[model samples]
Target: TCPFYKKIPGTGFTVDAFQYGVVEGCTAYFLTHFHSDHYAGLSKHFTFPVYCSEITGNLLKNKLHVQEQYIHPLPLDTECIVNGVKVVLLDANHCPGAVMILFYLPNGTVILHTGDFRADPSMERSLLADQKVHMLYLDTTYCSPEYTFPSQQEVIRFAINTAFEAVTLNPHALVVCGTYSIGKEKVFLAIADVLGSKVGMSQEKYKTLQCLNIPEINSLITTDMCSSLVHLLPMMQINFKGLQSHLKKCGGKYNQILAFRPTGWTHSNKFTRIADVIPQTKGNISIYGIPYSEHSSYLEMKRFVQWLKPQKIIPTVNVGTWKSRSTMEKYFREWKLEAGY
Candidate 1:
């Protein structure tokens, strides 16, 4: 699956992190985030010493439910050695629990894995002043020119204004939205602050936020808050077909506001119904099409590759196709095809 020769067998599937061919004699394995694409195969296959931000580690334990013994939590920007590799965790503005990892390999190879990162001006200003990255494992998920995303602040403001509008239209209606429990805590917190109430979240979300020690968010009030304002749960659980029946089952009392954050709003047509649930019936939903993505956009991806000037770049996740890989080489020729070994 190097995207050049033949597609390799089980050696590579999607996760680019696995293509490193066993990471022989390394100081440590750095996990950039707890997303399934990033860390799903971590505990079972590569059981080396793993490092992450303290908040991310706790979220791994609470939300993803990974064992503690396998984790080594370090503060953000703190440098530590593992498997002879100097590793540092930097804030990945994309997700609350995500971090960008810089690895100083034994052979003087400095690899910066921007595990699904975005350019947050604040985070970039804070981190860019510290060190200059040499090499990078680029996240090319959205490395196309047409892709445009709004800022996180804009997305939050849109959601807040929409929610306020919904409440004005229907005060008694219950609103239910869906988002990543760990990554989108700030969005929910913003809504909570504006509305003077909080929505419902799963036990996992509540616990993960608590572990992060977000001073403003009170997890203790999550359940009670959900019962009042909006019901916030995982997107997988509810949908249009099940929405009506589910609300009926809840005694037709809770007014439903179906909100969802789909992964590929640009490409995928599957979640288009997210826009359909408007403010009218109980199935009223708001789709904030503010192209705020957790992964770096195509321009950012190109910028990262240019910054690192790596001898080789291996793209991870589902977006890395043969054509995409070849295109990357056009921009950065040193990029070699070693995706799935």
Candidate 2:
């Protein structure tokens, strides 16, 4: 298991952990996102004041059955003080309502916890500039040189265009776009907007989208898969065997099936780490694993560390201590010596 709790020294505030009744004694609790991995051990029986974005708080109440009184909604780019600690929320750009927590401690130390976000230019100007960050809890999900990939916007275009072209080649074929429950809503929305069709999703997904309150995305949901040319489904449901089973159940109505998985693992080369889009196809299934990731790449992380210049770096994932320390040291040394920063 990964260490989910990061305590600011002598401040008594904990970030992203309510596990094992730890929230009862803490000064305050902050939830970065609603992902299960981040919100483990949280339930209805718990009683503590929890802070998160508005959308996440809604989901926490409506979906997870958590009581409303204990949930606090923090809007984006807003500042608030809890128990004499100055706190601000910044958009994480990972998923809807995801945010990075910035804490200004009483002892003049600034700690930032980037809760699963891709590096963007807006963050540089608004959050990074003129801030003396003493500690950074980095999202080290893809913290390696081999994980280079294109930006999310570029990959969205590539995915939509590729799906359109696949359908153009075979009109009767079913195009299925894979995504998680929360993230990658943009991919499906863009596909439906460009293809002039709506998308079919499960009831749970439709409800989640409604809670998000994005009108454009809300109008694009449908329960009837046959009504639309494209169907949006969970990432696990878009695999070869799964599609084969689905098509079999359809009694050979669809001529073929095209599936797309937007992820960073599509890039395999370490030495030649230029960002590129590549799609792979096999038999009745044309699956393209694009480099569309929510987390920052190794190079992006390097640049961010140089800009922040934190004295101590903490790895957020389950990576062992030696590897995490070694990777950070290697990047810091390279950026300082070779890049001359």
Candidate 3:
């Protein structure tokens, strides 16, 4: 195994692996978010001390049903002592309870683990921004100049306007927004808000949305079979055949159906290097594959590293493959050079 995968260099700590079992020097496991990719190794049988944001710990206890005795939920943006290490959990601004970890090692070295985040302008004055980060563990999910797309704000506005125009033109159109088990709640919620319609979702998803502290959440969700024109559903259900069956299931309450699948992989900075389905139609179904990313874009990360100027930046994703690490490092060089590093 590569030493850099999960194990932090020169420490008795690992970031997000539980299936690998205990290493020789490791003592504590830190989970950055509740996503399965980051928390894959954990199960009911595992026994290890865990440290993460309070919301993430809550998810582990309820969603994963992890034992409460082993979970320790820490506060956000506060320095805490964990086995003689100084650590703080900065709100990652990605998924529910997602956080970026700042580890202040004993010997005055600083390390940052971003843990799949979107760079927010509000986090401009973060504690990590002031320090000279020696090692930066980045979520380089979109790591190319050609991957830059619209910001989250712009994307949400686009969704709202598109829905408004559609409903304005066709008064009986039904809108279905694709979502995940945890992330991407904003896109659908905003649509429902603008339409002044209750959002129909599974009772289970409704309960999970309660954890996010959405305002007037109790009034926004409905479990009825066809009470509302706006519905929240999984991504796979937002396709032509799937939506056809959905329309059938709804008993033809509406004339037309519009589906929005929000993801980063669909759009890009290049006009053609990307090869995902764009906006298209099949029969009466209209599927709009929009770019609604939870992770930072290529330009966002570039701006971040240029501002922070970490001495060493590491790519978490796309690093395991051949030559991908070198290619990303070249981008890092280009960014820092522009930043006057």
Candidate 4:
């Protein structure tokens, strides 16, 4: 099994299954993030030590519920030697605790792998610029020019403004939004900041939000008083008519209800429509188009590719092979006709 194989009497480990094997005494795999695409394959055939940033480790443990032994947490931007291999984790803004990993081998080969990332001028500019990458496995989800998304800060502001407009139009309303449980907390936080008030919630969401250090936004009702304020909850449960009835009986008026369909709402119209029905009882239900997406947009990807200037960048997600590269070239070619690349 390629001379690197170390076998035990009862249990056998072989390196032949891998597409390519690292030299003997070399380190095991270095995971970039806990995203399903990158991590789902680990436990199936790999039992090697996995290294990551502290936040990524906590997220894997707390959110993904991965075991402690498999994940090794390191501080951001710090280099470490794991099983004789040098690895570094850089900040990835796609999701909380996500990261990009860089490996420097003893053989002098440098490879940078971006698990999933988005352009964030505040955090990523310096980190991405600090390194001289020899080979880069980019997050080329937007390799084709058609992919795009609003900036994180912009989306946060839009969510707040949309919530404010909905409330101003109808004062006595609760707003339900669809967002991924891990990343959606940011949207809720933005809404709370704009409204300058507490928000009500279910026990589970309240617990998850608590983990994120969602400041100042507290329960709508306290031990001593039941405050009238905006209540944010998952979109799915919002439409369970029985729960809506209970909330209404507890002084929630329909006109004071506002709801939004989060990212991927269009994937299933029936489910989204059912979720939208809950907030309609008291006032008009509004589905704000402001998006909360993690993937990089066409422009962002273009900027990133130009910055990295890799030898041969390949797209990992969305479209496979040079087809992904062609999609981006097509977008830029069209973009230059209208403006300049």
Candidate 5:
């Protein structure tokens, strides 16, 4: 019933087997990244070998405790033959170790699976040049035109400056940066490096980053929250209700708490501008929702599809129902009509 997991007609490969569970007779399993949503049912008990980038492989081993032997590292931009099919992994540019898979079937058809990637110019030059794709499995997280955000770099700069401004206004304020467990490492690392401050994270996140071996982030991590003026918190813990209770417990230990949530969903409405700061203040806490996302906006996705010119486009998320398929059809129709195809 899961549309995310599909079998290539002749290759016998399964892609992203989380909610769908593993299917029998699949020759190999390919994981795009270590995002919890992508690897839902996977665990240390998995018997099949999972193919993914080196960074993702390390996360699978260190974070998920999957047996090392069962996890195979797929080097980026390198071609490997698995089960008589040519497979190449390219940088997804969504998160560290995330990859977009290109599968060359024996029948001369090529398929691409963009595993939660943002639009990157280098990826197009490196992978899409002079190549025609047969089928594309797209990450349609922001498929609608209502979503438009600035580049990741721009958002990172905005977040860093916002944090600095917040602290500048309140000298005793603690800057808490909220992000996912795996993604948004770049944002936190940038803040740490630019502000010259250490970032405190949970022991679990610390371990995950340790295995990532990111030099910039590694040098700025701390286990004790009091060790640094800036703290790295899980995104889920930064909401209004949670922060209200947290700041109350602090009991004036800090003058105020400024939270930066860098996410794409902040700009879901048509009126919201890129890098627009939506602030919510309650008591001594101010939370800023910045437009930072790892997924492509509607325009970016349109450009990518038009450039690649795949024969068929498959939506990865919410693909099991007829309504979902109809939505994808409408998206493609709109794209085609606009592009004069």
Candidate 6:
């Protein structure tokens, strides 16, 4: 029962292959992003040379306390040679430091390691647009027929409008935007901007955001509790119990609560438009599970495969069990056949 890590064969490079102790043939370590699942095995004491995006490198050194010498911060859209194999990093748009790792072998084979991405139209016009990818390591987080989230723009627009309306009607409403580690930040940022309010940040969250060096968030961070009604909290704290507890303990600064829990799984499959996914409300508190995900949907994944036409599709998630692997493989094979590759 080992954690699934994308160790590129024919090369010493292991992309997000931490937490399994020392890999036998891993000469170079490359982390796709700063997510815990990807970088679980990495520690401050670890000594292997790691390659990743500049933002990811900063997080490793400043946030995770990883050594400086061991971290090699690669610039986005640039190519470099590690052990004679050409490697390039492209923006994944999953998070701040997320990327889709591209490797070129001598045999004219391109191995694309999409380390958790939200496939965008821009990637279709990317550097790899003209080239053929022999191997594609996919982020199969939502590789089934179930997940079909509305586009990010629509979702973000919906979230911003909802938050604005919620606050306009109830000025004293404590707006809480749910977020994971370093994802779905646009919602809260847009909310704060529209309302012309700052975000109430705890010391822990403030420091973590600072590590990401996002310029937009820097201007909206405020320690003053009453200065801003909007607060960015973890996804775990967006529940009803958490909402009531937070509102009760706020000392009368806010009259109601408006929490936006943004994730793909938050919305329903039957939703053809944004309006279909209504708000879950009780009294003054409202929890709007916004379908804004960084991960690609099943449709996007299928389209990407069809467009890229990679020779092999490797699932990078939910491969822990035999059944899971089989299920994912079946999807891959079907998609491959449909794409005529």
* Leading candidate by lDDT: 6
TM-score of each: 0.76, 0.90, 0.92, 0.70, 0.92, 0.93
lDDT of 3 at 295: 88
Candidate 2: C-alpha lDDT: 0.76
Clash pairs detected, candidate 2: none
Highest TM-score among the candidates is held by which one?
Answer: 6
TM-score of 6: 0.93
Candidate 4 lDDT, 72-98, residue by residue in tens: 777787777766566677777776667
Local accuracy of candidate 1 as per-residue lDDT tens digits, 274-318: 234233233353343333466666556655554444555655544
Better of 1 and 4 by lDDT: 1
- Against the reference, the lDDT scores of all candidates come to 0.57, 0.76, 0.81, 0.55, 0.79, 0.83
Per-residue lDDT over 239-314 for candidate 3, one digit per residue giving the tens place of the 0 to 100 score: 8888888888877678788899886765344563223435678877898877778888888888887777788887
Q: After superposition, which runs of candidate 5 have C-alpha atoms over 4 Å from their true positions?
A: 1-5, 18-22, 248-253, 267-269, 274-276, 337-341
lDDT of 2 by residue, 22-81 (tens): 644476778888888778778787678888999889888877888988898987776798
Over 4 Å off, model 3: 1-3, 267-269, 272-278
* Clash pairs, model 5 backbone: none
Worst 10 residues of 3 by lDDT: 268-277
Q: How many residue pairs clash in each candidate?
A: 14, 0, 2, 14, 0, 1
Q: What are the per-model C-alpha RMSD values against the true structure?
A: 6.4, 2.7, 2.7, 7.9, 2.2, 2.0
Write model 6 residue lDDT over 1-341, tens digit each, in one string: 23335778778888887878888777899999999988997879999989999889988988789999999988888778988899999999898889998999877889999998998778998888867889899898887887887888888788778878877887788889886688777888888888888887677677777777687666778766667778877789888888898888888888899888876764365555686667788888888877788999888888888888887787888877898888888987887787677
Clashes counted in candidate 5 amount to 0
lDDT of 1: 0.57
For model 6, name the residue pairs that clash: 19-41
Kindly report which residue stretches of model 4 are placed more than 4 angstroms away from their true locations once superposed. 1-29, 34-38, 41-48, 63-65, 121-127, 210-232, 235-254, 264-283, 320-341
